[PDB]
Amino acid sequence: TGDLINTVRGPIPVSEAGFTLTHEHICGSSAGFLRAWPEFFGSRKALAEKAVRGLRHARAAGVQTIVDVSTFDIGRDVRLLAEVSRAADVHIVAATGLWFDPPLSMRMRSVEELTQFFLREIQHGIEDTGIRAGIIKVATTGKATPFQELVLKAAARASLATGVPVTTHTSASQRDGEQQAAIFESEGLSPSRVCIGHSDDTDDLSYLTGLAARGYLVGLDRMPYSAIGLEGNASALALFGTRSWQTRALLIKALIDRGYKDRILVSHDWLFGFSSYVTNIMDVMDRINPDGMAFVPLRVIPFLREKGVPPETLAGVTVANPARFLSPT
Amino acid sequence: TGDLINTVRGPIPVSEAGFTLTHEHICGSSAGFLRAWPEFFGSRKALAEKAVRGLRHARAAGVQTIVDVSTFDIGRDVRLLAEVSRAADVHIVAATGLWFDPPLSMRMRSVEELTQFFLREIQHGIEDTGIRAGIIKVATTGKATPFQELVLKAAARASLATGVPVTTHTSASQRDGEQQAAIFESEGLSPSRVCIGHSDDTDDLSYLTGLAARGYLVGLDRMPYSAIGLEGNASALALFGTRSWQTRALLIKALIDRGYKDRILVSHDWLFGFSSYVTNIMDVMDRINPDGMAFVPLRVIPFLREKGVPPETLAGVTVANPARFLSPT
Ligand SMILES: [Co+2]
Ligand SMILES: [Co+2]
Ligand SMILES: [Co+2]
Ligand SMILES: [Co+2]
């Protein structure tokens, strides 16, 4: 009791977060896009309605909180998040940071300037809303670009000043987490403040246990993603991969079996609208996973239970781990 | 009489446009940036105040209208434009199109989809404001990227449907205008609907007269840009170049002397805030050209008069040419 986390509806006690999905999106887009071209999504109204239906379905399955890791350059619309959170009665934690599509006005900035931006979104509020970010999202796609090095350093500095955790996008097959770790540690950031994400995109347990041993949280966060049976769709293949959800879920058990139950975070990386990829990708996704953000509780958790993972362990992964991660520390 | 152009304050008669600067910016930024980080500019209030002071200075020097060619990805804020236009009593024509920093949500789009976006901003309104674009801005930096080819085609299609003109950013030293012309003509766009911009960044009159002969408008639109005396500043050198404003202004006379007075558009490419380049670039610019958008009437026009260009010719360049260009045709 006592510790608090910021959500799009204001502060909540850490203990009320409950079953928490730590890497999710209401909408995957671009800065200013929803404001300029809402018809891309049918309408803003239709997008909101779809998101509310989706979050209510997750809620029914026992999800109490999601962390929307959409940054500025993912086109995060905090007003939209607040609206859908209110209508579905599911907590949403918003993010600061930068993903891999920053515009020039961000790309030209120094580490000091980026630190000031991230601190603004955490301490003051996002835009003119007063809604405060509760996590910092960063990204590499292979070896960090020079700018990405600055972003990771600024994220470490903002985290040290505020206690808010850092979470990452990686190219997992390229083992980006090792370089990300080195950068964070060079700034004196504690590994317990960091989740190395998309770590279920690889079956390389040497890579994953190496990180877990050092105290990093390992994000197994793309559970429903698979293009099995859609191999003729090049764009779906490239984004989803050729590994089954069962293959992804097996990594949760693998890390538990190797003593790392306290180092695992589980999610879908789902969304309800998606403009930063090919047209109609959302329709393809909705066909692969009609359950959306209820997929983890409905399919993954029972799968693990049937493999013999104890209820206490599953509760520790889906409740205790997100709570420790999100609590400002 | 009769013909109309759309401005940020609504429709105006073409004949009231008067002395018009055809390539300008209130603020050079990025989509969503002003909303997310207004403190970059001191504040939104300070930016607006500076812009109002600047436009009032231009107005005093005889400027009646500017065309703000900031696109979505230049971080065009049409509400800001409306506010400053009202306060300074200077007409501002807003733009649609895409410059060279489009985010993924734009880069993934087809020619048909881009055409729909440009038509939305021209026919329906920008964002939720009802303010209609009166020009389409496009850009290459050397040979067009595959996406840039789509953008130029969509611009041609939107222009053919609405009569609104198209204006371009080029790498002038790379003679981009020739490829841009070929793309536009392949879509059946009339050259009289097109301005090939930043054409004063080169002294190549073979290139420029080639375009003018075909009926293109030639944009001599960076008049005050020079890093002479600032050669120790690498970023200023790269952006401003090493040619004097007099050297740029001489090209106006050159084209007049070769029979092309009706094919010339003159401007500054100035701005009052600038986040898409190095920090404090605005301070450097304000030192080089304290007159801002009054520089053309105060310095360039008298320079040309003193070289013997008749008043009637100068009036044709600064009034008649913009009127014919902007009138939907
Ligand atoms: Co990602
Ligand atoms: Co994601
Ligand atoms: Co330009
Ligand atoms: Co410009």
The answer to whether A104 faces chain B, any CB pair under 8 Å, is: yes
Q: Is A128 exposed, middle or buried (0-12, 13-18, 19+ CB in 10 A)?
A: exposed
Task: Say how many Å lie between the CA of residue B235 and the centre of ligand 4.
Answer: 17
Nearest-CA distance B239 → chain A (Å): 14
Contact at CB, B105 and A39, closer than 8 angstroms: no
DSSP one-letter code for B62: T
Q: What is the largest CA-CA distance in chain B?
A: 53
Q: Say how far apart CA B325 and CA B329 lie, in whole Å.
A: 9
DSSP one-letter code for B177: H
Domain containing residue B1: 1-329
The answer to whether the CB of A70 falls within 8 A of the CB of A80 is no
DSSP per-residue string spanning A58-119: HHHTT--EEEE---GGGT--HHHHHHHHHHHT-EEE-EEE--S---HHHHT--HHHHHHHHH
Q: Count up the domains in chain B and report the number.
A: 1
Strands (E), chain A: 4-7, 10-13, 20-24, 27-28, 65-68, 91-93, 95-97, 135-139, 166-169, 194-196, 217-220, 264-266, 273-274
Q: Which of B18, B14, B40 is nearest to B27 (CA)?
A: B40
Q: Say how far apart CA B141 and CA B176 lie, in whole Å.
A: 7
Strand partners of residue A264 = A218
Which residue in chain A has the smallest CA separation from B104?
A276
Report the DSSP pairing between strands B4-7 and B10-13: antiparallel
DSSP one-letter code for B163: -
Nearest-CA distance A83 → chain B (Å): 18
Contact at CB, B31 and A36, closer than 8 angstroms: yes
Q: Which of B92, B98, B72 is nearest to B26 (CA)?
A: B92
Residue given tokens 């007003």 in the structure block:
A79
Residue A171, classed as helix, strand or coil, is: coil
Task: Say how many Å lie between the CA of residue A267 and the centre of ligand 2.
Answer: 10
Nearest-CA distance B42 → chain A (Å): 13
User: What angle in degrees, to the nearest 10, is found between the helix axes of B146-162 and B111-119?
Assistant: 40
Ligand nearest to the CA of A25: 2
Which residue ranges of A are tagged as binding site for Zn(2+)? Answer: 23, 25, 137, 169, 198, 269
Residue B92, classed as helix, strand or coil, is: strand
At residue B304's C-alpha, the angle toward residues B303 and B307, to 5°, is 90
Chain A environment of B110 (Cβ under 8 Å): 279
Q: Say how far apart CA B86 and CA B137 lie, in whole Å.
A: 23
The answer to whether A79 faces chain B, any CB pair under 8 Å, is: no
Q: Say how far apart CA B175 and CA B184 lie, in whole Å.
A: 15
Q: Identify the H or E element spanning B138.
A: strand B135-139
Q: What is the largest CA-CA distance in chain A?
A: 53
Pairs across A and B, CB distance < 8 A: 93
Of how many residues is chain A composed? Answer: 329
Chain B environment of A73 (Cβ under 8 Å): 103
Cα dist. A107→A73, A99, A114, A150, B104 in Å? 11, 11, 10, 10, 15
Q: Say how far apart CA A216 and CA A265 lie, in whole Å.
A: 10
Which residue ranges of A are tagged as binding site for Fe(2+)? Answer: 23, 25, 137, 269
Residues that place a CB less than 5 A from ion ligand 3: B 169
Q: Say how far apart CA A69 and CA A75 lie, in whole Å.
A: 11
| Residue B72 Ramachandran class (φ > 0 left, ψ -120 to 50 alpha, else beta) | alpha
The answer to whether A47 faces chain B, any CB pair under 8 Å, is: no
Contact at CB, B108 and A31, closer than 8 angstroms: no
User: What angle in degrees, to the nearest 10, is found between the helix axes of A205-213 and A176-186?
Assistant: 20
Which residue ranges of B are tagged as binding site for Fe(2+)? Answer: 23, 25, 137, 269
Contact at CB, B120 and A37, closer than 8 angstroms: yes
Of B37, B101, B127, the CB nearest to A104: B101
CATH number at residue B291: 3.20.20.140
The answer to whether the CB of A156 falls within 8 A of the CB of A29 is no
The answer to whether the CB of A40 falls within 8 A of the CB of B108 is no
Q: Say how far apart CA A117 and CA B20 lie, in whole Å.
A: 37
